[PDB]
Design a protein around this ligand. Structure first.
Ligand code: 0FV
Ligand code: 0FV
Ligand code: NDS
Ligand code: NDS
Ligand code: 9D2
Ligand code: 9D2
Ligand code: MG
Ligand code: MG
Ligand code: MG
Ligand code: MG
Ligand code: MG
Ligand code: MG
Lengths: 308, 307
């Protein structure tokens, strides 16, 4: 019923996914992002906590709750801008260690809650890059908003998705939910940067393919398939085939790069215990690539082939 | 306080490990393999269901119980021969669908139960190779008994052609409910993954169970075999085992990336490929779970009995 991709990791879901949905819905209601039974029932039809349950298939308790809550908040925040600077600047302001969320919009109170939970156990090294990545994702909403008012090239679109999209924050989140911070000496290596970049783009473009009908029905031009078609004057099948080749190349690059990590850690003198943190984050990336694919394929959010 | 190896997969334990131990101990008692509270308390100190819980970190219910029970039965069966043809031939006889376990030794009644549960949902093709692998593991106990009553090369051959890993590799497919597609099972790539999983786990266990086996006088350990053959020191032989472990790990992770393109060349449908990828994940979990469990278990006290 949907485009199928060869993602070479098993399908996995956290065993506590069902209870996780109940807890996540209760959070969305407590934060004022879901109001009323009708909206809750519509929201649950998306399996909205199941994307976190697939990414974070062994997390428990508050770690699992955080992972699930991030995605639900994203749907509410993302869909808010399908409908600015003052608003987004308030979201960014919630990253400040001394931020006071009192009186802010519910989306920004919820973000403050997420960030406090996400950042508290992580190092200053992680927090610096996590603040940068959050800021880039949040402030980007102004670039999508201008495209809509005043279509990008293939190259520009790809740059905007991977430099300023939601994957840079989600990659940082993997380290938090798995409680596995990537050692700073290996984080900046070409190998780990390639793994981060390929995870980012694979997930972006798998989502573009599998959410295409929804975005077309809404008139959202921000989709690689539509961008390719406009730039190249190509058919729908041609552009889908181009996206497919790109997805396959990123998957291949990921799985060809991972085997280099143990020897790289040896050259950098990384203690074995710290290597296991890296290997755990890389497993989190595998689970993210596969979980994104399985969730985008199954979710009613993408019916086109509102709870707010 | 143990030899450490760089196994490039995360440490994972099934969330239901605690309850799985209770269910597994109850099975061992129901089968007559653990008798009395003292024996149970000694057995639990080994974390005996935790090896299944690490290998099968997402299994639930009866799949998890089977995974855990196999390892517990192995300890009981293995330790039985630290204490033969008539006996092992009865175990082998329990593989036949027509077998009647009534009146057999508790170890063979328990094996019959394991095999019924293990084989019931699997294809006839899987069952044929699983019967072969079980038969080779079981009948080998006669060669370990003969040696008690080998070269490095002979030892490695005996440990990987007729040891406990060939049955455990088949078990991965059962517990994960992911049979390796027939056209890819025989490829050099998949055979290399199976072989490297087999040898890595065997030799990581040899290194980490060395002190136990030395204390019992058991010669069946690569470190001891190397020392005898080469007249080398303990550190030399441990360093040799270390290099071998590292080489097998490297071969495993260098080989896995070949699988998607191989499946493409063989025309394997995508759903069947995911079965292969699941079994390979099971191999990763087995390599790492073996390491983490051998490193933590009281069974290996002798660094730096319930029957
Ligand atoms: C949320 C998921 C599944 C993954 C995280 C990274 C991606 C690809 C998105 F957020 C979805 O992108 P987009 O802005 O196109 O959102 P929708 O496709 O849900 O409309
Ligand atoms: C490690 C386990 C339990 C299973 C995986 C396969 C291996 C290496 C064994 F069964 C241990 O063999 P061995 O005959 O050396 O058994 P023990 O080391 O437990 O005495
Ligand atoms: C194994 C049973 N326990 C650990 C209580 C399950 C808890 C899962 S949770 O915290 O996500 O509800
Ligand atoms: C997620 C909660 N449930 C499904 C009851 C866990 C049962 C796991 S089991 O069967 O291994 O005890
Ligand atoms: C819809 C299938 C296809 C175009 O025909 C795109 O993935 C195949 O290349
Ligand atoms: C005991 C450590 C060592 C020997 O000194 C064996 O692994 C290091 O090569
Ligand atoms: Mg968006
Ligand atoms: Mg969107
Ligand atoms: Mg989309
Ligand atoms: Mg043995
Ligand atoms: Mg033994
Ligand atoms: Mg041993």
């Amino acid at each position: 019923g949907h485009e199928e991709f060869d993602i070479p990791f098993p399908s996995r879901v956290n065993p506590f996914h069902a209870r996780a949905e109940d807890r996540h819905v209760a959070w969305m209601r407590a934060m004022g992002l879901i109001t009323g039974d009708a909206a809750e029932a519509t929201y649950r039809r998306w399996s909205p906590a199941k994307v976190g349950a697939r990414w974070f298939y062994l997390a428990q308790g508050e770690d699992l709750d955080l992972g699930c809550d991030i995605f639900g908040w994203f749907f509410a925040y993302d869909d808010h801008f399908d409908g600015t600077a003052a608003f987004v600047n308030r979201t960014v302001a919630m990253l400040d260690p001394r931020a006071d969320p009192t009186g802010e919009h519910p989306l920004n109170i919820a973000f403050h809650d997420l960030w406090q939970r996400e950042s508290a156990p992580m190092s200053p090294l992680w927090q610096r890059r996590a603040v940068d990545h959050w800021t880039q994702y949040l402030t980007a909403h102004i670039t999508e908003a201008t495209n809509r008012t005043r279509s990008p090239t293939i190259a520009d679109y790809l740059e905007l998705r991977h430099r300023t999209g939601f994957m840079p924050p989600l990659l940082d989140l993997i380290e938090r939910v798995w409680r596995a911070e990537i050692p700073a000496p290996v984080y900046t290596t070409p190998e780990v940067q390639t793994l981060l970049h390929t995870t980012n783009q694979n997930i972006n473009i798998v989502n573009d393919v599998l959410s295409l009908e929804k975005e077309e029905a809404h008139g959202d031009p921000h989709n690689l398939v539509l961008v390719i078609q406009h730039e190249r004057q190509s058919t729908r099948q041609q552009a889908l085939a181009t996206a497919r080749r790109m997805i396959d190349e990123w998957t291949d690059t990921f799985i060809r790069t991972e085997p280099r990590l143990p020897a790289l850690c040896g050259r950098l003198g990384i203690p074995l215990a710290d290597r296991t943190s890296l290997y755990t984050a890389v497993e989190g990336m595998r689970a993210a690539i596969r979980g994104n694919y399985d969730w985008c394929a199954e979710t009613n959010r993408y019916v086109h082939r509102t709870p707010w």
